[PDB]
């Protein structure tokens, strides 16, 4: 059950009640497609049906040409955030594929998949991989296609032999279009890279918990968007690429989303107002005794009450950062603010409603679709829940509120920007903390007092 | 069309006038359904070749259908000086529509209204009257043409023309699923698979707007699609329904202008003794309801040669006196915004009808013609050159191109305002401010220096 | 072969050893698909094999009509710190508007009547090599025109549907892409430009044969850096402009800069001052100056070669190279930023990983087989990738380039220790070495005279 609190005193909001799925590990597997080494050229005859085998046979040499160029390439992920300088996310799959490039690794695959279509392959340089045959084009091409090419005089048969070769190429050709427009590395993992059957199975044969197995299966569209598929080789009549799947080694811990907006004084004199915005907006999830914080919006994906994030894109904070929602002046964690003189209207749509910051002569309203205007916001920072509100307007900008189901609570309090004397309030867009502003106030009180010695 | 441009030397900036507005203020939503037929009975022996083909194309028909059910189970969304934005949700109104279709009993209501015909308005329940279109009727084809073949245990293997025909009639159904599954069921731009021009043009032409707005959308169908969303909803009870959300241009043929700025720095020799200044709120500006809507980010507004298509969701409402800054940056009615610094480095900005060059220090700043070559060499300072004679511009080892789009430019002569500032008290840490807010900081230092005269 | 130096003095590393491939110019060709002008069925009847062709002709027309809506829609893309703004496809938009002039198409069609490849001088001075990649007009006018465009029309065989589909394929995909991409696409696909045409088009380019091997062996990078521009479908020919890159600077040294926060390690929270070298990214020697590429996307790497678009560059003095040898040198004023944020973090370099660790933070470095092999102390420290597979700072795990290369550790005393914390401007001052000196001296000035009593 999702609930939201609003803190009038700091113009912030926490959406509590969520449940974590935090990627911690990776699960790589190798997917092979066995290709039949069709050499070159057709059979003496230009029957339009033989002309048609050519065209579709021209596609297969071309698909192989592209996959041959991506093998030779050095794959790499082309995907206020100066706190992040992260590395690669496919370092583990590149780690398998550079070893698939070693001479003699393809025969080690061909041995393991001789009786089965899935086995764990013990190959060179100290890595095991689950390798899976998903497609056997060797059986087809060399059995009921190649003799019609193995015949220097091919009488093209009934037409349905051209339709069928279109159908067994189709997937391989969809694979190559993805790889070829993504320099080898594709995300999300499509259903042509890994069909539901194969994926729902590959998860099943993942050594994970029953907790993690049921979570991934019920969230397959979430899994594919945070997985990778990585072209590796086409070599010795086999195509292979590595797939890189997320491992959610944190589950069902509490998460919450912080929401923030400017908190300013509301004096009539123009320019003479100072502002205050808590600045660590984003996702927080309890993790391993600390708090994992995801400043990027793009990093986390919600499926109705569960937050899937990638710990690579996160900052580790002590659990006392939670106190920043209890009391910003607590002596245990120096809460982050930043100051300014910019009292400009702006509304933040939260998880269960909207923070509205209205200053000056700005028209700020909250509305129901059938009822009409149900609130007009005064200067200062207010909030409206999502019971009865469908939209919020600030000036001429229209914001839709979330209508999912949850209890809000409005937590009263005095706007803390009232606790500061403006004359010595540092407003030069100063991204600091609570004490580091007090850092400057005592200096500013003293810098005036020292010149008061006469 | 007709586009003009004034380059202001006094402040190292330009404004392009003559554009006319089309600002998105609302969403027109429609329900697009493709009737299906519920089959799971692939019982057929038919070892002969023309059954394997129909078996395989049919299999594609189920794994698409399965992909689409997982999407019904999902909850989609989007995450869409450029920071002040309004954080909202682009597709909240089409998700409202899609919630009712998840209620049980809503599909018959659709089938009741859409029984004979293709386009009707459907009262679903609790505040939903939605235009629904039936864009393809597979059920008839599958009960009438394809059920006789597969569903009989005889399984009379129909002509090869059936294998090809069924491929035609899956293709749209099969491209739609590709698009939804790799975008998580929200797509943009709305693609022709999702909505044809015949379909789109009709929906436009029967949008309850004026023929003007109809005439505008029909002649900018590619802009319209780029600003329209399509959200999958449900595949249920032999019906597939996806919600289509089309932009509604509530502000039309109001004047727009684009603001370009570049740094205005001094040209003293002793290096690092030069101060700078830069007008800040660059972007698109349009006249909108007695106010000015300002769209700081470039990916928002789209131009077709003289018409600017902006989404008001990503705008900032400003008083019509923000126009004063393009008249006099020292005006008393709007506190024009500037940011200041001491790092003076060359850079160039391509305007709508020319290019600003801000040449500073040891840099080679030129502007060339295609036929003649280098036709201008920038002395130190901020200057301008228009597209009447110039094709390109090089600043250091970087080359920009200019628009050969036709339009009268105007070089407005005047003295750079940073010559008015005494460098000793100039605030130039990296102050992100206004003219007066700067002047405020200038007064304090002067006051504290006047005191230090004893 | 690649190497990497870490500078303990200033918590930064430079990775040397790269060869530049800098896109300084463009190269436009026009791609044409000759089409046929054909209209409504005129086959009255509903034969099964005839309804298949009606669908396939409907796709043709719906693709032709949606192409037409692209020929009159102004095409452009939206292609970054103190970087300015340019327009990536103006070289191609130049040609595309000439093709809209009248007569240009018969001039094209004249030179390409017998040959598939020619150079055509259009009526504004500059000429363009133009090429013919699909001739459907002959196919629609010779093989199909008879059947469909006659009142009496036996559908000769079902194979007539198949080849019309197969001859239709590229035109239908070329229309798909141009439609989600408002007539300009990147990277260039093989539907837009197959491999043979591309290799050929490279072959005919006026470049060094060192340059031709470079593109030919990096086609996939070359495609990422090319654009495709929809121009016209009018008077029985579909023409779009391809704009391929001209890497006018080759075989010069490149290097990439990584930096991290360098703070003091007093135990008192907040009593620490930090220091970070700014302007991190890729640098390459270019024409007596050094082009700096601030954005990660602007350069694409193939192991020791860097392909960068110089539109998204900056031209810096070559003395900026001294900021890696002595950040106090009197010839170039090295850029830093001060803070009081002493957070632990890691940066993954070209050959290792920088860990700047602070507070009570657990920062290790681990091997796949061995486990932790180093717990970092409070400070800014480095580790080479021989031995190391991953790094953890808190609960976040970073992998490391396993790329072959040598690293050298340069010991020095952290510069953050050469500052009096009492007068150090640590209010997130994006400034330089001497600009920070100036705030210190001025602060030491108001300290100086106000303390004569
Ligand atoms: C001066 O310092 C005290 C503690 O040293 C701090 O709490 C206070 O906020 C400062 N003065 C003002 C007016 O804030
Ligand atoms: C500074 O204050 C004086 C009054 O002492 C005022 O006249 C002047 O206009 C102020 N400076 C500026 C730049 O407005
Ligand atoms: C600052 O300038 C004064 C000039 O009186 C000079 O004596 C002093 O050495 C300078 N600061 C430093 C750190 O050298």
Residue numbers in the entry:
A (entry chain F): 27 to 105, 138 to 512
B (entry chain A): 26 to 105, 138 to 511
C (entry chain B): 27 to 105, 139 to 512
Which sentences from the paper describe this structure?
However, while both pre- and postfusion states are usually immunogenic, the labile prefusion state has been demonstrated to induce a more potent immune response in multiple viral families.
For RSV F, one (R-1b) out of three designs was found to be a monodispersed, trimeric protein, as indicated by size exclusion chromatography (SEC). Therefore, obtaining the R-1b variant with a melting temperature of 62 °C revealed an effective optimization of the sequence to maintain the prefusion conformation. This result is especially relevant since no disulfide bonds were introduced, and stabilization was achieved only by enhancing non-covalent interactions. The accuracy of our computational predictions was reflected in the high structural similarity between the determined structures and the computational models, with root-mean-square deviations (RMSDs) of only 1.193 Å (405 Cα atoms) for R-1b and 0.53 Å (416 Cα atoms) for M-104. While no significant perturbations were observed in all our variants overall, subtle differences at the antigenic site Ø were identified between R-1b and its parent RSV F protein. Especially precise agreement in rotamer orientation between our computational models and the experimental data was found in cavity-filling mutations, such as E60F in R-1b and the A159L and V203I in M-104. Other mutations, such as the S150E and E487N in R-1b, did not interact with the predicted residues but still contributed to the prefusion stability by enhancing polar interactions at the protomers’ interface.
